[PDB]
Design a binder for this molecule. Structure first.
Ligand SMILES: OC[C@H]1O[C@H](O[C@H]2[C@H](O)[C@@H](O)[C@@H](O[C@H]3[C@H](O)[C@@H](O)[C@@H](O[C@H]4[C@H](O)[C@@H](O)[C@@H](O)O[C@@H]4CO)O[C@@H]3CO)O[C@@H]2CO)[C@H](O)[C@@H](O)[C@@H]1O
Ligand SMILES: OC[C@H]1O[C@H](O[C@H]2[C@H](O)[C@@H](O)[C@@H](O)O[C@@H]2CO)[C@H](O)[C@@H](O)[C@@H]1O
Ligand SMILES: OC[C@H]1O[C@H](O[C@H]2[C@H](O)[C@@H](O)[C@@H](O)O[C@@H]2CO)[C@H](O)[C@@H](O)[C@@H]1O
Ligand SMILES: OC[C@H]1O[C@H](O[C@H]2[C@H](O)[C@@H](O)[C@@H](O)O[C@@H]2CO)[C@H](O)[C@@H](O)[C@@H]1O
Ligand SMILES: [Ca+2]
Ligand SMILES: [Ca+2]
Length: 686
């Protein structure tokens, strides 16, 4: 299939995701609605169930509401079984309508549907070229009080009906009993409870094995992607081992939630996106878009900075999922604001790099503050809104114009209020002009583009007061006036002659797994694929076509490789970097080093004999290790993903800047378990 087919579960760059709060979308089957005090059919009480389900979604997929918009993927609430208790939070009754209070990860939430309904959802979707993404929240179960076991369901965890354990009298230690996080540090927010949510302990083999088993059930049910909830709140090493479980079984596009505040830029966030095997929800993008188009607390130079910065910070910026709002923020549209603000932000998001996600109801101009006012029932299924039409004109471009799906971004004209940028990939170009000033038009002179000489009609057809562009020689555009609140899109597409890799996925796996390389100019006859210097051709290349190649990862030593392809004629493509070849299946092991005293600003790291440990390269050591919660300084600890069953030699180091100090003595050694987890406790050797 081509890179753009619904069958492509490794790439979402050419798709537009529509985020649905199942309960608040459409009740297609009233028979499964909750009753009593846990239900409100009028959906006036937004913390109770309103009845939306999978049938409803199927109904909107079939009646053309979603397809009419140009939406090609839907991201739904966590489908697993949630607790049934109504929880009174100081007078207010609260239900698990949101789906984040899991009780059993191997069963469905009956309010949404049966496994049968779920299989039907996947089939209907797939039938209409819509990919299905599920929310998955393995950080915790539900709200529990260890001393008030009668509270809620005491955060009880079941394994397909079988009670695994509860928060109270947790002798197995499936959970964390470290108190609640104050979000003070990253380590603090990981090993302590999120509010009152029973924090699962991924270092317990039972929990480890159970979650990796549950995800496979869902993978086996045909999902096309996974949105991981609260990634900033689970150990990174564990998550990497979790992503290795998915990729080494049935790879699917995974992206996690790592909340970033306004003007917040986290290096931990960058490292996570670049090394965990999964990408992230682009909070940097979202916060900046709101400041610029919504709250006017920054201008075009700020948007530009974010664009060029992110592109440098994220190794695969095209895999970051963009949005302008979600269920954890006020809705972008404020009741009294000019709608043109939402429209422009939509046009910008849809044509920008990454994977755009649209929160259900946006196209209907829904307003609302924080939870739960931002989760009201969709008031209508009208296709007559300007927002609906903007999405409808622009969504398809991600499929037909690879410049938009994979292209680089470049500012071509800019001022406080105006931003003109160009996306380019191969022989494809797209230029977008946005004028946020709702009162002042702008005189655009000196605009230079990569567009071939000719005239260009605004792809939006003047919907947002865009205009025609006239490009003379040198791609220099003639002067024109950009209307107040003006937005226009111009483009040029043509066949690409040389092999151009636009995307690879999964980004991390062990040898033998098949990866998908998407792009243009591959030709129709099998060429060669290179992993570093190793050439692969013939049978291991399972499929080859102009826009897509499927190939098995050769049995090469674990490590980081550049990927390049050369067509049948021997013409080489661009280089795609940062592909990680695992040493084998992975397991999460906790490393602990005692009495490793440091000086302030000096941290302890770990390195070892395998690529998962950096191969003795301090520049690639794992850390810095933690020393607050689970163990306290001068004892350090860290959860790391290592190849299962391998005997590994390791050592710790103290690093300050790029200045490193090695542990004395001989390498410590240990053999990783074949499954489940383990804890290695050693003393720092001077
Ligand atoms: O009582 C249970 C509640 O749980 C549910 O909240 C969810 C969110 O909907 C998820 O999308 C996600 O979001 C968390 C996020 O993981 C977490 O970081 C936190 O964000 C902090 C952030 O760390 C901090 O840096 C600072 O910026 O403040 C942020 C808060 O704005 O909060 C997000 C939202 O809670 O995970 C949580 C838990 O899975 C549910 O939505 C609630 O209705 C429910 O009451
Ligand atoms: O002509 C090439 C030149 O175009 C753009 O410069 C704009 C500038 O952004 C506007 O603010 C205003 O000053 O008009 C200029 C056009 O002459 C690009 O920003 C710039 O990089 C580029 O060299
Ligand atoms: O909590 C992380 C913290 O650990 C190290 O700080 C040590 C410091 O080295 C010791 O001399 C002593 O004062 O205790 C601290 C632990 O609380 C790192 O030096 C520091 O950068 C790091 O943030
Ligand atoms: O460079 C590979 C090499 O790294 C480690 O050796 C350290 C050694 O442990 C230190 O005490 C110090 O001498 O620096 C060496 C790095 O040059 C590993 O211990 C070793 O097995 C490995 O080959
Ligand atoms: Ca229902
Ligand atoms: Ca946690």
């Amino acid at each position: 299939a081509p890179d753009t087919s619904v069958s492509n579960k490794q790439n979402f760059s050419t798709d537009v995701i529509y985020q649905i709060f199942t309960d608040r979308f459409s009740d297609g089957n009233p028979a499964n609605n909750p009753t009593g005090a846990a239900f409100d059919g009028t959906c006036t009480n937004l913390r109770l169930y309103c009845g939306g389900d999978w049938q409803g979604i199927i109904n909107k997929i079939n009646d053309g509401y979603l397809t009419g918009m140009g939406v090609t993927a839907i991201w739904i609430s966590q489908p697993v079984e949630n607790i049934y208790s109504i929880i009174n939070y100081s007078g207010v009754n609260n239900t698990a309508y949101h789906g984040y209070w899991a009780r059993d990860f191997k069963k469905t939430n009956p309010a949404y549907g049966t496994i049968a309904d779920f299989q039907n959802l996947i089939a209907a979707a797939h039938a209409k070229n819509i990919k299905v993404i599920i929310d998955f929240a393995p950080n915790h179960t539900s709200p529990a009080s260890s001393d008030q076991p009668s509270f809620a369901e005491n955060g009880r965890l079941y394994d397909n009906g079988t009670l695994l354990g509860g928060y109270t009298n947790d002798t197995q230690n499936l959970f964390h009993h470290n108190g609640g996080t104050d979000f003070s540090t990253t380590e603090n927010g990981i090993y302590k409870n999120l509010y009152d949510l029973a924090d699962l302990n991924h270092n317990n083999s039972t929990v480890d094995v159970y979650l990796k088993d549950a995800i496979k059930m869902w993978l086996d049910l045909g999902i096309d992607g996974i949105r991981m909830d609260a990634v900033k709140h689970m150990p990174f090493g564990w998550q990497k081992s979790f992503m290795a479980a998915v990729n080494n079984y049935k790879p699917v596009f995974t992206f996690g939630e790592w909340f970033l505040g306004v003007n917040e830029v986290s290096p931990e966030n960058h490292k996570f996106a670049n090394e965990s095997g999964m990408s992230l929800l682009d909070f940097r993008f979202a916060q900046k878009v709101r400041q610029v188009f919504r709250d006017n607390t920054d201008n075009m130079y700020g948007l530009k900075a974010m664009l060029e910065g992110s592109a440098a910070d994220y190794a695969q910026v095209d895999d970051q999922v963009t949005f302008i709002d979600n269920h954890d923020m006020e809705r972008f549209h404020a009741s009294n604001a000019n709608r043109r603000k939402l429209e422009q932000a939509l046009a910008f998001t849809l044509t920008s790099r990454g994977v755009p996600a649209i929160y259900y109801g946006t196209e209907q101009y829904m307003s609302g503050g924080t939870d739960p006012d931002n989760r009201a029932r969709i008031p209508s299924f009208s296709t007559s809104t300007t927002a609906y039409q903007v999405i409808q004109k622009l969504a398809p471009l991600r499929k037909c114009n690879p410049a938009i799906a994979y292209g680089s971004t470049q500012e071509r004209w800019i001022n406080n209020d105006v931003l003109i940028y160009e996306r380019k990939f191969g022989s494809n170009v797209a230029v977008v002009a946005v004028n946020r000033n709702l009162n002042a038009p702008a005189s655009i002179s000196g605009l230079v583009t990569s567009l071939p000489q000719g005239s260009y009609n605004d792809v939006l057809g003047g919907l947002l007061n865009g205009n025609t562009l006239s490009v003379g020689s040198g791609g220099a555009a003639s002067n024109f006036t950009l209307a107040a609140g003006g937005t226009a899109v111009w483009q040029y597409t043509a066949a690409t002659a040389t092999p151009t890799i636009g995307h690879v996925g999964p980004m991390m796996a062990k040898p033998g797994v098949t990866i998908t390389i998407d792009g243009r100019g591959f030709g129709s006859s099998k060429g060669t694929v290179y992993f570093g210097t190793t050439a692969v051709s013939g049978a291991d290349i399972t499929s080859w076509e102009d826009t897509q190649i499927k190939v098995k990862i050769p049995a090469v030593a674990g490590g980081n490789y550049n990927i390049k392809v050369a067509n049948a004629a021997g013409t080489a493509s661009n280089v795609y970097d940062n592909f990680e070849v695992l040493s084998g299946d992975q397991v999460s092991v906790r490393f602990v080093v005692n009495n490793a005293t440091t000086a302030l600003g000096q941290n302890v790291y770990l390195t070892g004999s395998v690529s998962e440990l950096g191969n003795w390269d301090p520049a690639k050591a794992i850390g810095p290790m933690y020393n607050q919660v689970v163990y306290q300084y001068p004892n350090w600890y860290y959860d790391v993903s290592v190849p299962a069953g391998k005997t590994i030699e390791f050592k710790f180091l103290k690093k300050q800047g790029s200045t490193v100090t090695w542990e004395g003595g001989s390498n410590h050694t240990f053999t990783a378990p074949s499954s489940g987890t383990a804890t290695i406790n050693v003393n720092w050797q001077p």
